[PDB]
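Researcher: Predict the fold of Excinuclease ABC subunit C.
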Amino acid sequence: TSSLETIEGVGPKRRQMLLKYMGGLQGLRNASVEEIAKVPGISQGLAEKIFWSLKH
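Model: Structure tokens for Excinuclease ABC subunit C follow.
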């Protein structure tokens, strides 16, 4: 239900950023908030948002 993929600042590419950062969703799936929290704004809010996306 969480619009994590279309967060108030995600959906266009922000998420992809991670891959623009890693170049592979897998890595993003392997990257929890800990890693995801290394992108634009994506520190905790987005980070988590993404975490719950691929992580678990």
